[PDB]
Ligand binder design. Structure first.
Ligand SMILES: CS(=O)(=O)N(CC(N)=O)c1cc(Cl)cc(CC(=O)Nc2ccc3nc(N)[nH]c3c2)c1
Ligand SMILES: [Ca+2]
Ligand SMILES: [Cl-]
Lengths: 58, 250
């Protein structure tokens, strides 16, 4: 995997490393799941989410 | 905003209203609890830098519902490359005097990493632009916050399709060329927000255009990806006395 294609499969941020290595990262207020790609909020009001819509679908 | 719709209250929770002596100045975008991104050109004629207020949680300018939060603007930071009276480098970073409190109606938009923004977000076709600007060219501004989905153009295509400032590498075009739907005067400084895999990100600032909803012309946005490192460094810096700060760019 490489960050240029399909964002390296990352939900949020992608870093290439020497070899066939890739690491995904998440913005502040999120943590990376064990899939190594998905980011989940760790705070009540993470950036870039709409609380009234996130509550409508929970 | 021309040809858009009312943003349902709380659905644009990052939108900022900037006031100068209580009068509408411009929009902005909250990117964390003390930091707002707006357009440099909004600040060319400020006489009293100490009467600039940012309002979060605003929706209907006619009423007070209790979700609004007002803050004094403590610092307006503009890139050294911006020249008043011109269009390029049209970005400002505003530090609030006290943090806003995040609530269902007050949430920051994510400031993406540069690589992510350039390689991924730049190819998401449609993004949202919002504001209390004019509803029509030469028309009244909006009392309720408005929002519009607009598609982004590659610059070569914007230039080919358009028919005067250049579109520089610090800008991009978005919108429609049929006169139907656009950003407008008064929306300046507001967000162009891009959705990717469940999260929204800041990709542009409403900046300029030839008229509004002008046939053969598109809205022009500040290309925020050029400024990510500049913004991030400033947000790590201590404040300096005096509201206006010109900071080197790059
Ligand atoms: C002429 S100047 O001296 O360069 N200067 C004066 C000043 N500093 O006030 C200035 C600079 C910039 Cl960058 C922008 C404007 C106003 C503007 O174009 N607003 C606007 C906003 C959104 C739009 N969406 C569309 N479709 N059209 C739009 C228009 C003025
Ligand atoms: Ca209100
Ligand atoms: Cl001052």
């Amino acid at each position: 995997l490489i960050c240029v294609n399909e964002n390296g499969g990352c939900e949020q941020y992608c870093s290439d490393h020497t070899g066939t290595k890739r690491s995904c990262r998440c913005h502040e207020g999120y943590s990376l799941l064990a899939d190594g790609v998905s980011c989940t909020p760790t705070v009540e009001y993470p950036c870039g989410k709409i609380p009234i819509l996130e509550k409508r679908n929970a | 905003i021309v040809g858009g719709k009312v943003c349902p209250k709380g659905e644009c929770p990052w939108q900022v209203l900037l006031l100068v002596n209580g009068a509408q100045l411009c929009g902005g975008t909250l990117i964390n609890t003390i930091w707002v991104v707006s357009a440099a050109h909004c600040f060319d004629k400020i006489k009293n830098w100490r009467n600039l207020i940012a309002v979060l949680g605003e929706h209907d300018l006619s009423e007070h519902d209790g979700d609004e939060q007002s803050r004094r603007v403590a610092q307006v930071i503009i890139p050294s490359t911006y020249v008043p009276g011109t269009t390029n480098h049209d970005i400002a970073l505003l530090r609030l005097h006290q943090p806003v409190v995040l609530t269902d109606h007050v949430v920051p938009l994510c400031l993406p990493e540069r690589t992510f923004s350039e390689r991924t977000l730049a190819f998401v076709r449609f993004s949202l632009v919002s504001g209390w600007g004019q509803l029509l060219d030469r028309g009244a501004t909006a009392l309720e916050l408005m929002v519009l989905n607009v598609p982004r153009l590659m610059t070569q295509d914007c230039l080919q399709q358009s028919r005067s400032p250049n579109i520089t590498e610090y800008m991009f075009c978005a919108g429609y060329s049929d006169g139907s739907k656009d950003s407008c005067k008064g929306d300046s400084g507001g967000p162009h927000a891009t959705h990717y895999r469940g999260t929204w990100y800041l990709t542009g600032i409403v900046s300029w255009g030839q008229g509004c909803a002008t046939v053969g012309h598109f809205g022009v946005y500040t290309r925020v990806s050029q400024y990510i490192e500049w913004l991030q460094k400033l947000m790590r810096s201590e404040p300096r006395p005096g509201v206006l700060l010109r900071a080197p760019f790059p």
